[PDB]
Each structure stands twice: as structure tokens, then as C-alpha cells.
Design a protein around this ligand. Structure first.
Ligand SMILES: Cc1cc2nc3c(=O)[nH]c(=O)nc-3n(C[C@H](O)[C@H](O)[C@H](O)COP(=O)(O)OP(=O)(O)OC[C@H]3O[C@@H](n4cnc5c(N)ncnc54)[C@H](O)[C@@H]3O)c2cc1C
Ligand SMILES: Cc1cc2nc3c(=O)[nH]c(=O)nc-3n(C[C@H](O)[C@H](O)[C@H](O)COP(=O)(O)OP(=O)(O)OC[C@H]3O[C@@H](n4cnc5c(N)ncnc54)[C@H](O)[C@@H]3O)c2cc1C
Ligand SMILES: Nc1ccc(C(=O)O)cc1
Ligand SMILES: Nc1ccc(C(=O)O)cc1
Lengths: 394, 394
């Protein structure tokens, strides 16, 4: 069995890369550990940068998004009994962000790949990578008992934080940068109209709260929660009461509550690995880096890694410029670090940290007051929020 | 012995306030623990905001400053083998800062006060404050053995961090916010031409370094140093070798060195007290708050506290509006916290901290890269550096 580019993982990174590649004539096979239904069960992201919206268009998978996605020109930050709106469009020079669930984006890509007839092997068990530094690397996996081999020219590791690809690089070739936060986010998806037409990030003494949405009749809410929490300890009613306690009274008053469709706790973490490649293996997305959700950069950084890898692969196959692939890590890391910095800043100013001295609390509050009250401060938030520009390459 | 406003401390705060008050017809007496020469021996500040320059003009003590002070339109930040210039004038909408030593400002004020014949009692020993909540507070002190009493309407505590005024307020009425940094600055004053026409703040792996100046033939340099250091362990030659090691090669190459005129170590600290007054006692300057030197806000915040106190006192005496004095703390604290936030940020991005993990070092470096590479980022530094506007009152 042979292909040009083997892709490990059928989450958004792998699917987007596979779609872009197929449309350009570069054959690729995707190997996924889980089933289509399992992948489709993950809620995750809701906010997309303009760059990701354009990439979906280029992959030709934007029909439903153009119809159903909601374009947001602003976002609100509530703290110390006040709500401040950041006009993203005005402050960033016209850019906006789009709210369209990750589940939906993934569904669109999966349907698109099926229709084109490209290869996808679900339940590909025990994937192993071989001869990464050779001129002919290969992947082995098991499908219903028998171990099969897939030969390829390159391998794109799009297998997330727990994937096999990053584990396949000699640990000594990698530099790991990581920070673990002492809290997680308890998220709740409900078939109820959102409390606002724009997102509301709230810094409240009891902890962080976020009011988001999926459509005009579907909402997604989050509350900061200690790591010791178990989801079974949080009934829907406990969640609504807690969420209400963290929001401005005028917002809590018109909040329409309802039974949860999904409820889960996600731990917050920052993680970056340098470099993002090894021989003929290139890491993309969560496989190479994790950002806390606060800045809504995770799926968006995955999109930029993919945009970059795809364009370099194109140069390699169409133009015989295989040497440009060595620049992959350098190009992606510039964007990754600025997004990590922004996600880290958002996290530190919106959440309540354990054992914080009086000085730090006051500085936290002053950061908000300064950045939300200065035209220059607002612009730094806005340009980072809508997403910094992708680098062009070469 | 009686006056209208008793002022404790003859450093810049006390002198500036006393001068402004005298010029407006409000009698005031200054009590200073040390001698004129001792006060004049402190080097300290070199950078003044436009607001402080205007206050000196209003006090009528700007002749020498207008002649000798250097107006700077920019400043440089060196990090990771690169120097980036921040055009303060362009980015802040036309404001600049002035380099004129604190020693000189103090000398100008002292000469001005002597010529006007206002009262100043040096070597005023064992100053004690009494009946702060009464309608008639008073100050007692000792002059060559005998204990004298000074009656007044109000008392301005301009006695610095170790003064008696803050200690005279019942500790329970005060909220203290403080942060101690694990390093200090070793400063060296030399009669040598500065290495640059603008200041250079340098983040180097060995620690922070700063190239400043006093005039075209006098320089002031600083290097970050551990708290365990003793000045006697730092010969002039050791200092020059260390400074050179922390600067970009092209800057170190044209550095003119020479014997030190003054050498000292200043510990870095952030300190704020709320409120800044008690009864008829009002704290101003270092008596109420300390900021690390990195942002050059100390003397400048003292100027804004003084500007505010003076204007409120004027309203009180000239217009019988004594009730406006209750707003002193609220007005000053707004500016103090934003300046504390800026000084804290500058300190965290330019210095090397003990036991820093890989993630934090990378974030530190990325903060610099982002703020120095974005038009919006540059503007946040510039507007804070030149100094945020003074509030108008009422
Ligand atoms: C609460 C939450 C909110 C978020 N909100 C946002 C937001 O609004 N905006 C945004 O930009 N980002 C957000 N993110 C981040 C975003 O969801 C992730 O960055 C994104 O899922 C990355 O996609 P990926 O394809 O790299 O990895 P994944 O989605 O993790 O997919 C990886 C795939 O590889 C498969 N796989 C794993 N191991 C193997 C193996 N050994 N062999 C074969 N296949 C394997 C997995 O099964 C999975 O299907 C959020 C994340 C969370 C948890
Ligand atoms: C290394 C260094 C660099 C700095 N660089 C800058 C810079 O470039 N720009 C800037 O804005 N700031 C800078 N600062 C800060 C600035 O020097 C201080 O904020 C400033 O001195 C505050 O003035 P002040 O009058 O409040 O207090 P002080 O200058 O401390 O004067 C207080 C006076 O009160 C007297 N006194 C004390 N106790 C008593 C008592 N019990 N009775 C009577 N009198 C008493 C003292 O003797 C002293 O004369 C720097 C500080 C340092 C140390
Ligand atoms: N920053 C975030 C904003 C929104 C969401 C979400 O809608 O799921 C998640 C993170
Ligand atoms: N930030 C600072 C800049 C300059 C000086 C100084 O010249 O003494 C001190 C601090």
C-alpha cells in the first residue's frame, strides 16, 4: 500500500491538510485510531480567525459555514462590576472572527473527503512510524487483526497531544516548554438561545466564566473550576447557579437555562515543542503545541501550521523544491509563540489564581483597567484576538 | 510657632509642594531631618515626564532646567542581539521626556525657596505628629536640644519611604500592597560622555543593564545585581567589564569609561498604601508608594501627588472648599496603580529572574518581540513611558 503523504489523525488538522492536498493533486492517506462517531462527539472550539475561514474556502469546504457561521465584530469583558466592549472590527482595521463549531467544521471536512473518494482508514490500531530519516519512511498499523504497511514520502503527524507522532522523535532532538495551570474549565452545551449576540468573558471573584454560542438556539458556557473537580459532582442546576453568580446581574437576569447536551472538564495547559519536525515527519496542530482555551487559538494555530505545511509540500511536489521543507519549524514557531504569549496573557488576567497576594490581585485588576481603557491597549487585544497575519514563506 | 501647611521632608516632593504653595500665598514650613548637603548628595532620578517639567515651570523654578535639560524623543531596548528604537514622540502623539538629574532639580528648588525667604528647618530631629483628627494638628521636633511645637492646619508627609508620617497613621486604617524583587541595581555615575544620545535599556542573559546620562559630559550606568552584593566588592574596573559584557558589541566598543564619582546599590521594590491620608495628614511621594526604577516613575508620581494636593489645598484656602480634600487619595491612586502596573511590566520583561523555567524565559522574550514589533504594542509602551495624563479634579 502506497501514497505520497501519510497523515496520522482525522481531527481538523489532518482532514484540512488532506483536503488541501487532494485538491492540489497530492495523494494522501489519513489513519485514525477512533471511529467517525467518536471524533464527531468532541465539542471543543467555537471561534475561528479569518485566516482559518479563508483556508476552509480554499479547501472548498465553506458552503455550510458561509450559511450557518456567525460573524462577530466585537466581544465583551466583564470585571469589577462593569462590562467593556472591544470593537474588534474597528480596532483591528476591519477583521472579524467567525463562530462555527469545531464539530461542524469536522463534519464538513469528513463529508468533503468522502465525496472526493480520498482514502481514510478509521480504527487504524497501533500506528507505528518507521525510517523517519530514510528516503522511504513507512507507517504500520493494524486493521481487524492484520498488520498492514503503508509506504509514503512524508508523514504529517496530526494526532493531537496524545498522538504517536511526537513520541516517535528521539526525545533528545526535542526541547519542551510547558506550563500547567492550577484549574480547568467546566463546559456546558445547551439547546438554549445565547444570553448575548457576542461573547462575554468574565473575571469574577469566584472565578472565570465565559458565555459563548454555537447558533441562535444553541449555547456553550464555561466556568473556571479547580482540578480536583469531577463532572459528576456538577448537576445542571449547580452549573446554572454558579454561572449566574459570576455574571453581571443584568446578564444573569435574562439568561435562558436548560438541560445540558454535553458537560465536560478540560484542564488548562501551555505546551510547545521545538523543532516541529524530524526527517520526513512534520508535526501539526495539537501534536506540536497546546494553548489554554482562553485566547481561542488552538484550532486556529493548527490551521496556520497546515497552511504552511501544505504550501511547502506543494513547492516540494510541483516545483521540485524539497529543500524548502527545512523551514517549516522556523516559520510556524514565530506564529505559535506570539499566540502562546497572547493565550497566556488572557489566561492570567481573566482567571482567579490560588494563593495570590494583594499586590498581584491589584495588578491583575489594573491590567484590565489599562488595556480596556486605552486605545492602544484595546488594539493590542483586538489584533491578537482576530489573529496575527500568516507569514508568506520563501 | 505657627503656619498653614507643615511639610515633613525637604526632598523634591516637599520642596515642590512648598514652592507651589508659597507662590499662591499659602504659608508653609518644611521640616527636614538631614542637612542640606546630605540631601544634595543623593543622585537618584534622571528622567522627567512632561507633566513634571510643566509643574517646575508653574513653580517658577525652570530656568536652569530649560537651559541644561536634554529633551529625548526616543529610547532604545536591546535584547537577543538586536536594538529597537521606540519613537516616543511619534507614538505618543508628540510628547517627550526630559533628562535632568534629581540632584539638580532639588538644588534649583532649594535656591528658589531660600530666595523667597520661606521657612525651612534642617536637622529637625525627632519629628512627631499630633492630633491628626483634630481641627488643630501640630508637629513637635527638636532643634539643638530643645523641643519646639509647630501648629498648623494641615500636614503633608513628604518624608519618603522611611519617614515618620506613614508610621503616624493607625496601622489598621491602612492597606499595604508590596512586592520585593530578588535583585537590585548597581549604579555608577562618571564624568564621561554618554555612549548614546538616548537611553539604552538592555535585557541580556547575564542580567539587566541601562545606559543613561546627566549631560553631554556626565553618564549614569546601571547593572542588575543580586541582593547579596556589597558595593565594596565592585571596583570601577569590574563594573565597566560587566557593563560591557551586557551590551551589544557595537555599543560596548565606543563606550568611554572613567573613574566613578558615585557608586551605590538600590534594591527594587513595589509598595502602595491605601488610603494616602488620615485626618489632616496627606501622604505624597515615596511616603505613600514605591515603584521599581525600571519605569522612571518614582519622582514623576511624586510630582502628580503634589500637583493634586496643591490644587486641592488652593481650593480649600482660596475658595473655602475644604471638603474636596477627601478626594485626594481616590484621585492619586488611579494614576499610581497604572504607573505601578507599567513599572512592574518593564521590570519583568527587562530583568533576569532567579529560577525561571524554560516556558517563562520564552514568554519574556516573546513579550519583547511582540511589543517592539507591533505598532499598537509600541504605543502602549510609549504612552506609559512619557506619562499618562494627570486627572483634572472636581
Ligand atoms: C474547551 C476547548 C475549547 C477550545 N476552544 C477553542 C476555540 O474556540 N478556538 C480555537 O482556535 N481553539 C479552541 N480549542 C482548541 C482546539 O480544539 C484544538 O487545538 C484542536 O482540536 C486541534 O486539532 P488537531 O487536529 O490538531 O487535534 P485533535 O482534534 O486532537 O485530533 C487529533 C486526532 O488524531 C487522532 N489520534 C490520536 N492518536 C492517534 C494515533 N496514535 N493514531 C491515529 N490517530 C490518532 C485522535 O483520535 C484525533 O482524532 C479548544 C479546545 C478545548 C478543549
Ligand atoms: C536608582 C534610582 C533611580 C530612580 N530613577 C528615577 C527616574 O529616572 N525617574 C523617576 O521618576 N524616578 C526615579 N527614581 C525615584 C525617585 O528618586 C523617588 O521617587 C523620589 O526621591 C521621591 O521623592 P520624595 O521627596 O518623595 O522622597 P525623598 O527623596 O526620599 O525625600 C524625602 C525626604 O524626607 C526626609 N525625611 C525622612 N524622614 C524624616 C523625618 N522623620 N523627619 C523629617 N524629614 C525626614 C528625608 O531625609 C528626605 O530628605 C529613582 C530612584 C532610585 C533610587
Ligand atoms: N475562548 C473561547 C471562546 C469560545 C469557546 C467556545 O465557544 O467553545 C471556547 C473558548
Ligand atoms: N529608568 C531609569 C532611567 C534612567 C535613570 C537614571 O538616569 O538615573 C534611572 C532609571
Amino acid at each position: 500500500m502506497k501514497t505520497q503523504v501519510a497523515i496520522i489523525g482525522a481531527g481538523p488538522s489532518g482532514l484540512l491538510l488532506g483536503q488541501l492536498l487532494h485538491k492540489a493533486g497530492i495523494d494522501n492517506v489519513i489513519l485514525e485510531r477512533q471511529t467517525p462517531d467518536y471524533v464527531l462527539g468532541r465539542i471543543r472550539a467555537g471561534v475561528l480567525e479569518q485566516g482559518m475561514v479563508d483556508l476552509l474556502r480554499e479547501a472548498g469546504v465553506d458552503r455550510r459555514m458561509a450559511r450557518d457561521g456567525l460573524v462577530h465584530e466585537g466581544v465583551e469583558i466583564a470585571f469589577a462590576g462593569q462590562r467593556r466592549r472591544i470593537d474588534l472590527k474597528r480596532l483591528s482595521g476591519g477583521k472579524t472572527v467567525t463562530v462555527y463549531g469545531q464539530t461542524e467544521v469536522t463534519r464538513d471536512l469528513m463529508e468533503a473527503r468522502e465525496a472526493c473518494g480520498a482514502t481514510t482508514v478509521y480504527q487504524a490500531a497501533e500506528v507505528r512510524l518507521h525510517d523517519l530519516q530514510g528516503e522511504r519512511p513507512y507507517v504500520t498499523f493494524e486493521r481487524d487483526g492484520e498488520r498492514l504497511r503503508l509506504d509514503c514520502d512524508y508523514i504529517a503527524g496530526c494526532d493531537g497531544f496524545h498522538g504517536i507522532s511526537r513520541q516517535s522523535i528521539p526525545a533528545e532532538r526535542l526541547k519542551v516548554f510547558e506550563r500547567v495551570y492550577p484549574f480547568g474549565w467546566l463546559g456546558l452545551l445547551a439547546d438554549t438561545p445565547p444570553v448575548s449576540h457576542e461573547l462575554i468573558y468574565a473575571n469574577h471573584p469566584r472565578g472565570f466564566a465565559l458565555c459563548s454560542q454555537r447558533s441562535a438556539t444553541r449555547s456553550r458556557y464555561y466556568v473556571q473550576v479547580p482540578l480536583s473537580e469531577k463532572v459528576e459532582d456538577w448537576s445542571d442546576e449547580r452549573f446554572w447557579t454558579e454561572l449566574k453568580a459570576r455574571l453581571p446581574s443584568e446578564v444573569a437576569e435574562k439568561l435562558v437555562t436548560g438541560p445540558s447536551l454535553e458537560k465536560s472538564i478540560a484542564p488548562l495547559r501551555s505546551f510547545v515543542v521545538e523543532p516541529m519536525q524530524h526527517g520526513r515527519l512534520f508535526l501539526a496542530g495539537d501534536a506540536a503545541h497546546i494553548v489554554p482555551p482562553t485566547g481561542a487559538k488552538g484550532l486556529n494555530l493548527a490551521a496556520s501550521d497546515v497552511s504552511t505545511l501544505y504550501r511547502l509540500l506543494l513547492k516540494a511536489y510541483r516545483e521540485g523544491r524539497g529543500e524548502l521543507l527545512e523551514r517549516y519549524s522556523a516559520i510556524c514557531l514565530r506564529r505559535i509563540w506570539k499566540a502562546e504569549r497572547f493565550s497566556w496573557w488572557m489566561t492570567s488576567v481573566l482567571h482567579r489564581f490560588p494563593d495570590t497576594d494583594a499586590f498581584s490581585q491589584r495588578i491583575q485588576q489594573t491590567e484590565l483597567e489599562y488595556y480596556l481603557g486605552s486605545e492602544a491597549g484595546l488594539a493590542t487585544i483586538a489584533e491578537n484576538y482576530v489573529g496575527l497575519p500568516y507569514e508568506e514563506i520563501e
